[PDB]
Amino acid sequence: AQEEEAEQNLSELSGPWRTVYIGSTNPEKIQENGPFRTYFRELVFDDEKGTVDFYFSVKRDGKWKNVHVKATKQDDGTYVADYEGQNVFKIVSLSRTHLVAHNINVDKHGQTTELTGLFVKLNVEDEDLEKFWKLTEDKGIDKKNVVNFLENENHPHPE
Amino acid sequence: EEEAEQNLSELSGPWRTVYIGSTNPEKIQENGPFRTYFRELVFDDEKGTVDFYFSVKRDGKWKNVHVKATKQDDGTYVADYEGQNVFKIVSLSRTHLVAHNINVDKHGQTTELTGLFVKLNVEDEDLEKFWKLTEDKGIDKKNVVNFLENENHPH
Numbered sequence: 044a045q046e047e048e049a050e051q052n053l054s055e056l057s058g059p060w061r062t063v064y065i066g067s068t069n070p071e072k073i074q075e076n077g078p079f080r081t082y083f084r085e086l087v088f089d090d091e092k093g094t095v096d097f098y099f100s101v102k103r104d105g106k107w108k109n110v111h112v113k114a115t116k117q118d119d120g121t122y123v124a125d126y127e128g129q130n131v132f133k134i135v136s137l138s139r140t141h142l143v144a145h146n147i148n149v150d151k152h153g154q155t156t157e158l159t160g161l162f163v164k165l166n167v168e169d170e171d172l173e174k175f176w177k178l179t180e181d182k183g184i185d186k187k188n189v190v191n192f193l194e195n196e197n198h199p200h201p202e
Numbered sequence: 203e204e205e206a207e208q209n210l211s212e213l214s215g216p217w218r219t220v221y222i223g224s225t226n227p228e229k230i231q232e233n234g235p236f237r238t239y240f241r242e243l244v245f246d247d248e249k250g251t252v253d254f255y256f257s258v259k260r261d262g263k264w265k266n267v268h269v270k271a272t273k274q275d276d277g278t279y280v281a282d283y284e285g286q287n288v289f290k291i292v293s294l295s296r297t298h299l300v301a302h303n304i305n306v307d308k309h310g311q312t313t314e315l316t317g318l319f320v321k322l323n324v325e326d327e328d329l330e331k332f333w334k335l336t337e338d339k340g341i342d343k344k345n346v347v348n349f350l351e352n353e354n355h356p357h
């Protein structure tokens with residue numbers, strides 16, 4: 044018998060996430076204009092389909108791009124996805140607030156690059172949301188006069 | 203199992219805007235002065251001040267702005283920005299900030315705003331796990347990019 048099945052419930056970790064650090068065995072991949080200089084925005088985990096949808100932004104050729112990548116889990120436990128080549132992604136450490144991962148990428152020229160990363164989740168609690176909505180109602184502010192800054196196209200550029 | 207000692211200064215660091223509401227919609231519309239994306243907040247218990255670092259788009263371009271607020275005896279804070287402001291903290295903890303701001307502009311017009319902000323917390327052990335994995339893979343420290351500080355100091 045090899046290892047046993049892992050009870051996986053990552054669905055609730057879905058939500059807004061941000062990149063803290065990304066390291067690489069090949070500096071070119073994460074330098075300015077690099078394909079892996081990725082600013083995370085959102086992660087969605089589906090325990091039933093065994094997938095993870097990545098939503099992030101990257102600057103290419105002097106232009107900002109919003110990207111969406113779908114990863115599929117394997118018996119191996121790792122995830123595979125297509126993005127600037129083939130990728131084998133492993134979650135090394137995970138909690139309600141952080142994600143530490145290791146990714147192996149092989150580009151169109153067979154070049155292998157190993158990357159490490161630390162991402163943090165932006166947790167918005169129900170208790171705090173309720174406090175905000177009550178206060179907003181107390182001040183006579185209409186719901187239509189409230190702007191969402193977490194999911195908004197018009198935002199500042201990191202570079 | 204351990205947690206850092208609770209200090210008001212421990213609340214300083216990267217913060218992000220979640221929601222901002224206004225009695226005057228024009229103030230938070232595109233190019234409005236209060237459509238602020240927070241970057242960092244610095245709390246100083248000694249001086250009774252809070253330094254705000256945010257970005258706001260004006261005339262089609264993003265600007266980085268710094269505002270220093272000073273605490274009053276009644277616990278509220280006063281700050282000069284697009285007129286006079288009295289900022290009150292309604293709820294505050296290690297991860298969230300709910301506030302109410304009263305602004306009176308250069309024309310005597312009053313606007314009341316509400317806001318919800320969240321702190322981005324990076325724990326020591328998580329950082330250590332990242333650095334250990336990074337060295338396990340033979341990655342040089344100079345081959346690591348700090349995305350968080352880039353977002354905290356945009357252009």
Ligand SMILES: C=C[C@@H](O)CCCCC
Pocket residue numbers: 065079081097099112124126130132144145146158159160
């Ligand atoms: C491999 C998928 C990309 O969208 C993420 C790259 C960052 C992980 C180090």
Ligand SMILES: C=C[C@H](O)CCCCC
Pocket residue numbers: 222236238254269281283287289301302303315316317318
């Ligand atoms: C007064 C300076 C602060 O940045 C005010 C922001 C108001 C948000 C509710």
